[PDB]
């Protein structure tokens, strides 16, 4: 009940078991390369499917032969696209016309809202072509197919979910392409004539079929039968559904953008999309799985076209040349492997030519880069996948001792230098001083040598030895073990992961496997006991010598593997990576880069100077791949780095686990239906090498020692920097590493000369790095490496000469009706849509095309779940069971308008176009609701919709949700299951840490602490939440959150009935507003006019039982869009025509006229950058290694001291809280508190300890041309400024966002300027007097019970340096 088949595709596509279905139906199929499957006995749960009568009539008049899945892929897509309109009666519900109607209404609403906010009428006009109801049905080629596959995919999820009944099936009959779904399989059925298509034979028409039938007269098997069949899995069908949804969203966004702008829109035109989509489909049909080798080239080709845009230098075309040459090489291989004539393979040439010959702008190429997964994914074979891994991990390397020696010495030097600049002194050396002369007179005088002289005396660092650093018995988090992970089984039972019938024998020993279920099963779990396990080399026992691979989900290569270890070896790996990430990986900056065109000139001159202004700095970068490093590491290279780490931590043998253990295992893939080719019963203990599996892996594996490998990479880059004497800055993404070389020029230098010389210097560095890594066994491949003066990857974004490029489609094309939540929750789906929308707007400049898609999918979720919910019987109609009559359009609309904080279903707040972090969601929600009801003309419903009956909530609910209301409808579904999860923990747990944390009387402690935190005379809920997060109750809640995402723990009939009743109750509360009313509350509310007064009254009334007559403070803050209004001071003459207009305290904003870079022209504001940076304007003791417990105790002491009065009795309130985390007495703690004694409690709490937004939710190019000045807002620029509602960090974000949104579509010039001001309004500003919280009673509960938990308690808080 809790878990269902996945809504979207997340698993590799494996088609081994299909071979077993075809053999039981009498058909022929050759998906697998494994010879075990040709003659094994069929597993019973598959062999029994041949008895279903529905499947036998579906297979009448079919041929004995079948075809693979992709050879049909082409015809499947075309047939569903053109035939889906004749089956509207199948999905008559889903009400398609109503989806379009709601989306159109939402765009009109948002246009009205933004016109009112920006202060200009008519900024946004009417292209009557996008606004008609018939636009999308008539002009989008994927509309009807997408709706049909949404319906069919829900049916398929239901059938797979049932455990196999032999009568549970679904089918779809079309003009072509009949479908049939049974337990795990889907069968596609197409007429033979549409595949032969006037050709000599079947192989003549589709040459890719020669792999299954080499050259055989197939006509005896195809004359008497009209149809042919392909067998596939449920994942193939889900992947098809995903492809239709992605293509529909992409086409709709592009079409609407091109009607909005029509001169330049940052999206590829529709001609290019139609061509690429058709040609990729044909390539896949013709070349089957391989086609992905050609299609995999779309991304590098887009990058190479972007790179050809700056000032001409021949090197700027080299990457593109390399890619084109690479593309045809692949083609030449494929054409000889399938014996394809040149005239047959025109689709491949058309694909490359369409990309190159389309002359798009850099923005359109950057968006087209995002269509990489719009053709589906390939079938994976574990033997093809492991041939590559085996070859790379067993090869022999040629290494040079001098290079290895020098990079090791640089490693030790980096560690020593970071220690000295951190603690102002040398660490305590224990080696003889005589051996190293240069370093001795720097040690005796306590000075550190300069960067310039380090290389000459580099060898002396080999002899340096010292005292241990980084004590081991403390790690910061200690909650990384609880988290979910996949593990392998122990070596006694390594066969148990395969099928008994495919194997051919019954394994003697049968095995649980999950990490959350095995962390709870381990009876002791010390942290010192893991250390002891590693130190004594206990793992080398025969029981722990198993390792198994598994393949990755959504990629286009032949298969990438991630590895799985036994449970206790996984603990050893986790502890080692955490120790390294806290202590020693801190000395290596792997993300030191920032984009150089956006950096200040003084900082560049200081950083790019070798030693220590009339100089010019120009940078150039190149990109290397870190993925290919893992298999190339050998022990001869890494012995020394590992040994030095062991010494630095005092431990011995801890960091050697991977190189000692991995070469002793048997490497294989744990696929349920593909055991190793050659394993038999007697052969089982020591099996031999075959195509699947092998012995003696000598390199690393993808994620086993990531921290150490990144540190070694940083050390070689520093060595190269010493050798070439050029300043370098390196940054690490998930996969790529970008290196920037900074070079200095005189003032009088031609621009062309600088461009050429900067690239030459970057190339010297690239050559030097290639040699340095080649002599370490790691080979950079110069063909996939480019050197450029403008192109960079910095965050997860791409920049060209400092101009950020859009990447909106990457996130907006995956928008859908359903997400992965519990029991198919409606809020889960709507919340997923809302978050994807807010990220999507941050990465583009067109607003309305994405907003239409988000609104469309929201209404679709409501309709689909109303009549096809998986948790109910097949046809159920939730609305009829609840309200005794179907819902109407107006009722669904009103639910989707009401904000979630008020108990509705609206997750697309327009204010999030300006900034993500909103100070107070209640006031902004009330502002939005009032505007929407004024647009809808139903202005009398405001006080009816906001005044709902309060529920029944305790004090703990109010502490967990400080800023919300007590309405039943705003509550999430997980809060109803948490109570069950906790119960299973007290039944199935043997872990001592968990049993001590969840002791017998923990519920009473939570209740008592929450009641006490709300017992101050003025109640402050933000303070209560901050404190509660750091007491042991907060830790208990965090651990609950980690363990929730599990099975048979959350799951454990009557559970189905509990969930069904909850769901019906939630639907009644969301979609009925006359049922929930307090006429008294509405009568009381109608008098107020400001939104702040309304929020205060609602919070007071909703929580009356908890508050007991006391008054609440520190929660209500004004909405910025209601506190400030935009007034336009000066607009140039060319913008007055476009905006269709004819002619004290404030913030002032203007547009900077000077432009630094631009791509392609100066005609749009988001195509250019400037000079400005408006965001930059806005402890006596300290321990070296503070644990998490000490950090949280310090925060609690700080907050509670700052809230109370000086003449109070502060110590007795602090002891009961502080005694539960650390062992310090009261007085010692104050020695670590920073400076205090300045602030105004109500106002200064929010800004001191609140969570703010540091920027506007727009692309970052506009901020570089904005001149914001907050000096003119009078007495608020600390007189009455520290004592007001205004937050002066948020007015800057608002000013940048208004400037960006207003000119998002305007056509700019060299003569255009803009200046306006944000004016303060009097209604919302309040004068909040300084007020203290008075606790009349200290906490009376024994919180001192956790001295045994190291997860909660710090027994010796200060054992590291006092510093």
């Amino acid at each position: 009940p809790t878990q269902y088949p996945d809504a979207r595709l997340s698993s590799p596509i494996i088609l081994d078991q299909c071979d077993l279905l075809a053999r039981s139906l009498g058909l022929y199929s050759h998906y697998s390369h494994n010879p075990k499957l040709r003659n094994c006995r069929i597993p019973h749960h598959i062999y029994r499917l041949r008895n279903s009568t529905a499947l036998k009539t579906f297979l009448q008049n079919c041929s004995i032969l079948t075809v693979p899945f992709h050879s049909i892929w082409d015809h499947i897509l075309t047939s569903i696209q053109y035939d889906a309109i004749n089956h509207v009666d199948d999905f008559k519900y889903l009400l398609p016309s109503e989806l379009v109607k709601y989306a159109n209404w939402d765009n009109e609403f948002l246009k009205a809202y933004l016109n009112k906010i920006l202060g200009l009428d008519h900024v946004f006009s009417a292209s009557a072509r996008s606004q008609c109801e018939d636009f999308s049905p008539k002009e989008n080629p994927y509309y009807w197919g997408m709706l049909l596959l949404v319906h069919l995919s829900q049916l398929a999820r239901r059938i797979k979910g049932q455990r196999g009944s032999l009568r549970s099936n679904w089918k779809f009959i079309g003009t072509d392409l009949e479908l049939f779904g049974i337990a795990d399989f889907v069968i596609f059925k197409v007429p033979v004539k549409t595949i032969i298509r006037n050709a000599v034979s079947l192989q003549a028409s589709k040459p890719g079929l020669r792999i299954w039938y080499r050259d055989q007269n197939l006509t005896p098997y195809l004359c008497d039968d009209e149809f042919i069949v392909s067998v596939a899995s449920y994942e193939c069908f889900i992947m098809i559904k995903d492809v239709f949804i992605e293509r529909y969203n992409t086409w709709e966004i592009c079409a609407r953008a091109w009607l909005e702008d029509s001169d330049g829109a940052d999206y590829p035109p529709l001609d290019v999309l139609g061509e690429l989509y058709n040609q990729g489909d044909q390539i896949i049909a013709m070349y089957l799985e391989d086609g992905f080798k050609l299609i995999k080239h779309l991304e590098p080709l887009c990058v190479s076209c972007i790179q050809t845009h700056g000032i001409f230098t021949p090197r700027k075309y080299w990457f593109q040349s390399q890619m084109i040459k690479s593309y045809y090489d692949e083609l030449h291989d494929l054409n000889l492997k399938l014996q394809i004539s040149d005239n047959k393979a025109e689709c491949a040439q058309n694909f490359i030519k369409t990309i190159v010959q389309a002359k798009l702008t850099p923005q359109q190429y950057c968006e087209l880069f995002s269509l990489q997964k719009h053709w589906g994914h390939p079938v994976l074979y574990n033997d093809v996948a492991l041939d590559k891994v085996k070859k790379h991990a067993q090869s022999t390397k040629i290494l040079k001792p001098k290079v290895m020696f020098e990079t090791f010495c640089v490693f030790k030097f980096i560690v020593a230098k970071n220690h000295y600049h951190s603690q102002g002194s040398w660490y305590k050396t224990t080696h003889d001083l005589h051996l190293t002369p240069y370093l001795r007179q720097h040690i005796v005088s306590n000075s550190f040598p300069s960067q310039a002289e380090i290389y000459q005396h580099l060898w002396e660092w080999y002899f340096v030895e010292h005292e241990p650093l980084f004590s081991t018995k403390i790690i910061s988090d200690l909650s990384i073990f609880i988290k979910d992970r996949a593990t392998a089984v122990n070596q006694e039972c390594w066969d148990s992961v395969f099928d008994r019938s495919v194997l051919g024998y019954n394994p003697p020993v049968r095995f649980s496997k999950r990490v959350p279920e095995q962390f709870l099963g381990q009876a002791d779990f010390s942290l010192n006991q893991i250390l002891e396990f590693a130190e004594k080399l206990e793992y080398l026992a025969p029981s722990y010598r198993n390792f198994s691979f598994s393949l990755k989900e959504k990629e286009l290569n032949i298969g990438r593997t991630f590895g799985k270890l036994p449970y206790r070896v996984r603990n050893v790996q986790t502890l080692a990576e955490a120790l390294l990430a806290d202590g020693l990986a801190k000395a290596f900056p792997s993300n030191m880069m920032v984009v150089t065109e956006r950096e200040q000139k003084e900082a560049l001159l200081h950083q790019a100077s070798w030693h220590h202004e009339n100089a010019i700095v120009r940078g150039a970068s190149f990109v290397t791949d870190l993925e290919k490093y893992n298999l190339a590491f050998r022990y001869e290279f890494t012995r020394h780095f590992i040994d030095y780490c062991n010494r630095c931590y005092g431990v011995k043998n801890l960091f050697d686990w991977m190189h000692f253990l991995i070469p002793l295992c048997y490497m294989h893939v744990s696929d349920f239906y593909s055991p190793p080719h050659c394993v038999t019963e007697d052969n089982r203990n020591n099996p031999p090498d075959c195509a699947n599996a092998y012995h003696y892996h000598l390199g690393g594996i993808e994620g086993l020692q990531q921290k150490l490998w990144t540190c070694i990479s940083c050390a070689q880059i520093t060595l190269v920097e010493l050798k070439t004497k050029l300043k370098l800055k390196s940054s690490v993404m998930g996969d790529n590493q970008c290196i920037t070389t900074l070079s200095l020029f005189p003032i009088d230098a031609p621009n062309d000369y600088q461009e050429n010389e900067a690239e030459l210097n970057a190339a010297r560095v690239a050559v030097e790095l290639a040699i340095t890594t080649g002599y370490s066994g790691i080979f950079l491949k110069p063909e996939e490496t480019f050197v450029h003066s403008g192109f960079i990857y910095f965050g997860k974004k791409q920049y060209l000469n400092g101009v950020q490029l859009p990447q909106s489609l990457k996130t907006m094309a995956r928008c859908g009706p359903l997400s992965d939540s519990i029991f198919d929750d409606l809020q889960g789906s709507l919340a997923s849509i809302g978050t994807s929308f807010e990220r999507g707007t941050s990465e583009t400049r067109h607003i309305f095309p994405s907003r239409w898609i988000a609104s469309f999918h929201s209404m679709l979720a409501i309709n689909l779940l109303n009549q096809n919910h998986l948790g109910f019987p097949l046809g159920f109609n939730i609305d009829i069971s609840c309200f005794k009559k179907p819902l109407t359009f107006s009722e669904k609309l009103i639910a989707l308008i009401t904000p979630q904080v008020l108990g509705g279903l609206s997750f697309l707040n327009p204010e999030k176009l300006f900034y993500r972090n909103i100070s107070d969601p209640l006031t902004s929600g009330l502002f939005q609701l009032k505007n929407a009801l004024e647009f809808l003309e139903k202005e009398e419903l405001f006080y009816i919709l906001i005044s709902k009956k309060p529920g029944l909530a305790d004090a703990s609910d109010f502490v967990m949700n400080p800023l919300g209301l007590n309405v039943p409808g705003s509550k999430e579904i997980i809060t109803f299951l948490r109570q069950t999860v906790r119960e299973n923990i007290t039944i199935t747990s043997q872990n001592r840490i968990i049993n001590s944390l969840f002791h017998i009387g923990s519920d009473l402690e939570d209740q008592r602490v929450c009641e006490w935190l709300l017992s101050s005379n003025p109640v402050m809920s933000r303070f209560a939440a901050d404190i509660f997060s750091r007491t042991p109750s907060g830790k208990r809640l965090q651990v609950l959150g980690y363990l929730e995402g599990t099975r048979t723990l959350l799951a454990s009939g009557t559970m189905l009935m509990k969930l069904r009743e909850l769901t019906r109750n939630r639907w009644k509360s969301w979609f009925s507003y006359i049922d929930a009313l307090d006429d008294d509350l509405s009568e009381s509310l109608e008098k107020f006019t400001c939104t702040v007064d309304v929020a205060n009254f609602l919070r007071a009334y909703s929580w009356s039982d908890v508050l007991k007559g006391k008054r609440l403070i520190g929660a209500t803050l004004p909405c910025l869009l209601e506190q400030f209004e935009v007034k336009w001071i000066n607009l140039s003459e060319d913008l007055r025509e476009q905006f269709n207009l004819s002619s004290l305290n404030y913030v002032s904003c203007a547009l900077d006229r000077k432009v630094v870079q631009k791509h392609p022209s100066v005609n749009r504001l988001a195509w250019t950058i400037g000079n400005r940076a408006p965001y930059i304007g806005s402890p006596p003791l300290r321990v070296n290694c503070p644990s998490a417990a000490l950090k949280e105790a310090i925060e609690m002491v700080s907050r509670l001291l700052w809230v109370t009065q000086g003449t109070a009795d502060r110590e007795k309130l602090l002891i009961p809280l502080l005694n539960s985390r650390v062992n310090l007495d009261y007085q010692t703690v104050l020695n670590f508190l920073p400076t205090h004694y300045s602030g105004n409690i109500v106002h200064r709490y929010n800004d001191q300890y609140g969570q703010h937004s540091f920027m506007a939710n727009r692309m970052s190019n506009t901020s570089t041309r904005a001149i914001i000045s907050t000096n003119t807002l009078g007495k608020y620029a600390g007189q009455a400024a520290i004592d007001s509602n205004i937050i002066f960090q948020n007015t800057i974000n608002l000013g940048v966002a208004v400037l960006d949104i207003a000119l998002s579509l305007a056509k700019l010039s060299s003569a255009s300027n803009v200046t306006f001001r944000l004016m303060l309004n009097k209604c919302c500003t309040r004068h909040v007097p300084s007020e203290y919280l008075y606790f009349d009673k200290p906490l009376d509960v024994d919180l001192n019970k956790y001295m045994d938990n190291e997860l909660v308690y710090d027994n010796d808080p200060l054992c590291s340096g006092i510093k």
């Binding site: 075309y317 040459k325 001792p401 051996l435 190293t436 060898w459 001869e636 030459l760 080649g774």
Partner: protein, 217 residues
């Protein structure tokens, strides 16, 4: 003797560090020279243990005495020598054959089997023979960056690029004039006295019966 003693102290310390690092790195199983040679001669492949060579060139030449056969050890050395050949003026520079160069030009042209496709084949072959393919590619790219299409670029390169001055068009053997591609039929002419590429004559079609047609672009 202070200087002649201090120099020896520093050099000895450095020598000590380097050779200590080496022995720890490959220790305790490395194959000495005599055992390495014996195993290689008797088996035909080097042992599965680490070994130390004097130079990279010595490693490239490690093969069985009786017959010269490449071995995993030799391959490792050849890969590394190709890396050492890199220079920083030609890092990631495209190396293109005459056939390869033609494919790139086709990718930039519109249509199919037009006169410009034949012109691209002819120009790429002539440029590669005279060793000026890299300069030819850079000139083409420059004209593209100025803002023109591939067709104007090819015409301008035929006129001005140095390798094509005073070069006679090649001769293509065909069965008849129906064999020439359909889009190129309209451009056929009669053979001029002294055809040359820089004046606009691409190639010469000679039929099976001695009839010659000249392609003009």
């Amino acid at each position: 003797m202070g200087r002649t003693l201090e120099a020896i102290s520093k050099g000895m310390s450095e020598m000590l560090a380097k050779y200590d690092h080496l022995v720890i790195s490959t220790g305790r199983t490395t194959a000495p020279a005599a055992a390495f040679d014996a195993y290689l001669n008797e088996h035909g492949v080097p042992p599965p243990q680490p070994a130390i060579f004097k130079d990279l060139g010595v490693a490239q030449q490690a093969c069985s005495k009786g017959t010269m056969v490449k071995n995993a050890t030799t391959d490792a050395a050849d890969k590394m020598s190709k890396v050492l050949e890199l220079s920083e003026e030609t890092f990631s520079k495209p190396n293109l054959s005459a056939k390869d160069l033609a494919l790139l030009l086709f990718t930039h042209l519109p249509g199919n089997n037009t006169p410009f496709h034949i012109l691209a084949q002819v120009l790429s072959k002539i440029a590669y023979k005279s060793g000026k393919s890299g300069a030819f590619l850079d000139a083409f790219h420059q004209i593209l960056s100025e803002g023109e299409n591939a067709q104007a670029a090819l015409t301008r390169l035929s006129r001005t690029f140095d390798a094509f001055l005073g070069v006679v068009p090649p001769v293509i053997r065909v069965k008849n004039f129906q064999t020439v591609p359909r889009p190129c039929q309209k451009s056929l002419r009669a053979v001029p006295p002294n055809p040359t590429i820089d004046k606009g004559w691409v190639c010469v079609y000679s039929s099976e019966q001695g009839e010659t047609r000249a392609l003009k672009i």
